[PDB]
Design a binder for this molecule. Structure first.
Ligand code: PNG
Ligand code: OLA
Ligand code: PLM
Ligand code: PLM
Ligand code: GLC
Ligand code: MG
Ligand code: MG
Length: 466
């Protein structure tokens, strides 16, 4: 199984998950600083990202890890609150700029291509206090931050992700309220946030296109989470339609407007409008894009950035009583096949990624695809000789080769989540996704390879597997 010459082999981190230095060098608070400091068991053992992997202090150690893997690409994110403590360019933290410039320069001198994310679940607290993604004001704040990032780093950075996993963010932060600001708004908050996230992405893309592209010649996208979905009963038409409709709801809701025509999928619009009307709302809970907005949003992605971990089965579930929520709007229930293995919510279903990549090829006119996340967690404490986990990786890579060679999918980058064991949001340090083990009890935060790191380096070196 030889991959295309020039295939990108990457690993990923995110600012709040690895950096620490949460209040170092003038850095402003982000929503996770506030959230984790409030405790109340919203996070495993009230843990925080105050220190995390200490990557703000120990970049050199991450670089060693990157070099040892032989990565061709490295995905990391910029901390908005580190660069602009209040969210705005009224005050620019030069130490923040110097830090990210050092990363970029170090990567490039070692032949590693940076894949840089502007924003990864970590809004400056000030901007959340002004309504976060539920308010229209954030669109301009994000655009200006994007312009600042392009101007500062765009002479060396050519692959950009504007917003990490916008679909999950809208649900977790604003619908379920599992993430900060932590207020549930079942069936309203997610859609209101999604509408603004899509517009802010589009605004930032046009800023890049109109102001930076001619000079810088890079490309810009946003990353999206995708769970592959199959009908629970394969002979049930209602289950067959429900599985397709649930893909449309979680993935195409964002991808269609941005990649196709600047509007939501029709089934999303009709389901939500119809439910909202019977529920007694004067408007659909899904905010409409104006005609000017559709025109702005259409064609605002230079490649398809997707994130895959798992698959689920889907059964139709009629919302007879008009219950409020996204699952109820979609009229679906999800669950795994009892025969599947799992580690946490990650049920190991490798053929899920092949099916997904085929779906993207067929639905989004054969785009360039970067898989910016894929991986497997281990429970803490985790064995260094992680042979079982590595087996799940190998199986996944066989499916990637299959998608490329059989389905002719234009997959160009595979990126493992994560380079490092890190702060796994509400799970804290109890869920270990890293190719490198990190000791969170030792003040030096030493990195040590898992077997997966060694085996993944072999894959990269051979540009494939047997
Ligand atoms: O909140 N409510 O009062 C309320 C809401 C919905 C309702 O009917 C349901 O409407 C859905 C969308 O139109 C149909 O897909 C479904 O088949 C039907 O059972 C009845 C009452
Ligand atoms: C803990 C389980 C998480 C594992 C990921 C699987 C998620 C399954 C969701 C199916 C997509 C259905 C489309 C509607 C989105 C609803 C999102 C939500 O509010 O929960
Ligand atoms: C509001 C519009 C968004 C449409 C719904 C998108 C749903 C995205 C899928 C949610 C999966 C959550 C992943 C986290 C899994 C976990 O670790 O618990
Ligand atoms: C949550 C109660 C608010 C007090 C009621 C005044 C606001 C009425 C207008 C909103 C109508 C939609 C209510 C949701 C109905 C439902 O989910 O079934
Ligand atoms: C992608 O998924 C990983 C694992 O859940 C998470 O830690 C990242 O922050 C997210 O972008
Ligand atoms: Mg709403
Ligand atoms: Mg990404």
């Amino acid at each position: 199984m030889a991959f295309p010459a020039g295939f990108g082999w990457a690993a990923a981190t995110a600012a709040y998950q690895v950096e620490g230095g949460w209040d170092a060098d003038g850095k402003g608070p982000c929503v996770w600083d506030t959230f984790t400091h409030q405790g109340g068991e919203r996070v495993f053992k009230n843990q925080t990202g105050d220190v995390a992997c200490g990557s703000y202090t120990l970049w050199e150690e991450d670089l060693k890890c990157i070099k040892q893997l032989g990565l061709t690409h490295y995905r990391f994110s910029l901390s908005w609150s580190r660069l602009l403590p209040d969210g705005t360019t009224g005050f620019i933290n030069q130490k923040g700029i110097d830090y990210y410039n050092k990363i970029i320069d170090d990567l490039l001198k070692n032949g590693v291509t940076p894949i840089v994310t502007l924003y990864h679940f970590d809004l400056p607290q000030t901007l959340e206090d002004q309504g976060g993604w539920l308010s229209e004001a954030i669109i301009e704040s994000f655009d200006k931050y994007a312009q600042f990032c392009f101007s500062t780093f765009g002479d060396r950075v050519k692959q950009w992700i504007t917003i990490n996993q916008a679909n999950v963010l809208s649900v977790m932060s604003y619908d379920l309220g599992m993430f900060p600001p932590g207020i549930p708004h079942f069936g309203t908050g997610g859609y209101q946030a999604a509408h603004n996230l899509i517009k802010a992405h589009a605004r930032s893309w046009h800023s890049y296109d109109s102001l930076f592209r001619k000079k810088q010649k890079g490309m810009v996208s946003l990353s999206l989470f995708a769970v592959w979905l199959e009908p629970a009963d394969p002979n049930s038409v209602s289950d067959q339609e429900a599985a397709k409709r649930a893909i449309t709801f979680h993935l195409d809701l964002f991808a269609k407007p941005i990649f196709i025509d600047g509007d939501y999928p029709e089934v999303v619009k009709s389901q939500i409008a119809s439910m909202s009307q019977k529920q007694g709302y004067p408007s659909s809970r899904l905010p409409e894009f104006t005609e000017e907005e559709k025109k702005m949003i259409k064609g605002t992605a230079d490649f398809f950035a997707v994130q895959y971990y798992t698959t689920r089965l889907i059964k139709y579930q009629e919302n007879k009583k008009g219950e409020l929520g996204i699952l109820q709007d979609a009229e679906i229930e999800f669950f795994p096949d009892p025969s599947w293995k799992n580690v946490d919510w990650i049920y190991v279903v490798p053929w899920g990624v092949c099916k997904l990549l085929k779906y993207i090829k067929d639905t989004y006119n054969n785009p360039v695809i970067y898989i910016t996340e894929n991986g497997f967690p281990q429970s803490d404490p985790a064995p260094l000789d992680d042979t079982q986990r590595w087996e799940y990786f190998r199986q996944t890579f066989q499916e990637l080769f299959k998608a490329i060679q059989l389905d002719k999918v234009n997959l160009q980058v595979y990126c493992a989540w994560s380079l490092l064991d890190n702060f796994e949001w509400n799970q804290g340090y109890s869920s270990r996704f890293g190719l490198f083990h990190v000791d969170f009890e030792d003040p030096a935060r030493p990195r040590v390879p898992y077997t997966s790191a060694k085996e993944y380096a072999k894959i990269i070196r051979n540009n494939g597997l047997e």
